[PDB]
């Protein structure tokens, strides 16, 4: 009856997944949405380093083991929703610009951004990424896993019982967790996607404690606000 957690997915069943890495170490999730662009949380950009070669890993299942599918590209420029510095609070959404477009095979595909589709609370969604299962684990998950979640209601998520206004869940964010209203995925899950009913809806917002009742996960919703932003960077490109 009790006991419940995530499960490791079928190797390379999420061809769009990407690992953001500093010095070869995974720090966040991301979603390839165009040959030379990754979408991830902005929290995921370590600012206290001019070094630590930032790299993106695609077509991977195991963060450790070698793989005929893996592709390591280099970040050309981080495009965060904030300008230079600004307020490193809300708007936890970022665009990673790669040095070269990535080879597209069956283990490495793109995921499309949501459009007209909306997201009602109560929906069963799935989070994908490399987040550890031990609240104390100092290392992320080796294999790529997946957890099921339920979109909580803002009214209930903004209650005194939950975040109670701090952070306040605006119209662009969304909550999700188990019946205990808590977050499953732990270390290294930030940046991953929130796919519901087969539609890429949001981005896992980083910087939140895992395993605490009434403290669900926050997600950045791909609202018109960010579609616009996305479209401008990716369109127009640099062809001409």
């Amino acid at each position: 009856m009790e006991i419940i957690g995530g499960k490791e997915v079928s190797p390379h069943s999420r061809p769009f997944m990407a690992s953001i890495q500093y010095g070869g170490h995974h720090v966040c999730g991301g979603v390839l949405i165009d040959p030379q662009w990754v979408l991830t949380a902005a929290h995921c950009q370590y600012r206290f380093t001019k070094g630590q070669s930032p790299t993106v890993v695609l077509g991977a299942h195991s963060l450790s083991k070698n793989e005929a599918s893996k592709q390591t590209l280099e970040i050309k420029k981080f495009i965060p929703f904030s300008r230079v510095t600004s307020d490193p609070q809300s708007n936890d959404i970022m665009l990673v610009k790669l040095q070269t477009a990535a080879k597209l095979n069956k283990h490495v595909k793109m995921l499309h951004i949501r459009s007209k589709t909306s997201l009602r609370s109560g929906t069963k969604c799935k989070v994908t990424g490399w987040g550890a299962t031990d609240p104390d684990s100092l290392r992320p998950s080796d294999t790529l896993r997946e957890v099921t979640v339920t979109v909580l209601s803002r009214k209930l998520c903004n209650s005194q019982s939950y975040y109670n206004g701090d952070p306040f869940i605006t119209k662009d964010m969304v909550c999700a967790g188990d019946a205990k209203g808590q977050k499953d995925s732990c270390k290294g899950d930030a940046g991953g996607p929130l796919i519901c009913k087969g539609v890429f809806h949001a981005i896992v917002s980083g910087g939140h404690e895992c395993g605490v009742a009434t403290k669900p996960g926050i997600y950045t919703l791909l609202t018109k606000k960010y579609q616009t932003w996305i479209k401008s960077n990716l369109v127009p490109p640099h062809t001409n």
Side-chain angles (χ1 to χ4, degrees):
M1 301 180 271
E2 301 178 301
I3 296 70
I4 186 282
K7 293 179 176 297
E8 157 183 345
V9 311
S10 215
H12 307 90
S13 49
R14 275 59 192 169
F16 50 82
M17 289 299 277
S19 178
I20 310 283
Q21 296 182 318
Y22 274 105
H25 304 303
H26 168 90
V27 288
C28 277
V31 185
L32 186 67
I33 61 168
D34 196 75
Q36 210 183 308
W37 293 91
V38 161
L39 179 77
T40 185
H43 162 80
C44 299
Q45 173 193 187
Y46 194 73
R47 322 178 314 179
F48 316 114
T49 185
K50 180 64 182 61
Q52 303 194 57
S53 56
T55 203
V56 163
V57 184
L58 293 161
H61 179 55
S62 175
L63 251 44
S64 184
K65 301 166 185 176
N66 190 185
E67 273 164 354
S69 315
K70 296 197 191 191
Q71 290 181 43
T72 287
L73 295 67
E74 274 175 348
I75 301 171
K76 182 180 180 181
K77 60 183 63 179
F78 297 89
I79 325 292
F81 203 75
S82 76
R83 51 184 57 181
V84 182
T85 55
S86 299
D87 295 55
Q89 305 293 177
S90 301
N91 301 301
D92 187 15
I93 175 77
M94 176 169 71
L95 280 169
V96 177
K97 215 303 171 59
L98 316 175
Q99 286 183 179
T100 310
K103 300 182 298 182
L104 301 171
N105 57 207
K106 192 155 183 179
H107 298 331
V108 179
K109 73 146 72 295
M110 305 176 270
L111 192 69
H112 298 75
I113 307 180
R114 156 231 267 183
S115 190
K116 292 177 59 183
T117 318
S118 309
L119 173 53
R120 305 167 307 165
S121 88
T123 313
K124 297 182 178 60
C125 300
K126 301 176 180 298
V127 170
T128 304
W130 278 278
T133 55
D134 188 60
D136 283 284
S137 184
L138 235 170
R139 307 300 297 154
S141 183
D142 195 60
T143 58
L144 181 300
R145 42 194 62 256
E146 202 164 65
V147 291
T148 292
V149 298
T150 312
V151 180
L152 268 50
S153 170
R154 286 189 171 64
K155 192 213 293 68
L156 169 279
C157 203
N158 272 155
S159 317
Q160 60 292 300
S161 184
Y162 284 33
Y163 289 125
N164 188 51
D166 173 286
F168 174 95
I169 282 59
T170 73
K171 172 179 53 53
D172 289 335
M173 306 175 258
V174 85
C175 294
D178 62 356
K180 299 187 298 181
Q182 72 155 55
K183 178 168 180 292
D184 301 299
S185 64
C186 297
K187 243 279 181 176
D189 66 54
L194 173 67
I195 309 294
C196 317
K197 242 87 177 307
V199 164
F200 181 23
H201 278 101
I203 282 300
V204 182
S205 168
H208 305 86
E209 204 180 4
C210 81
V212 188
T214 78
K215 291 181 176 60
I218 300 296
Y219 293 80
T220 311
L221 225 74
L222 301 177
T223 61
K224 276 281 188 169
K225 164 176 172 168
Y226 303 130
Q227 290 159 190
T228 298
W229 169 69
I230 303 291
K231 188 271 293 183
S232 293
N233 305 289
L234 271 67
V235 189
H238 286 62
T239 304
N240 300 301

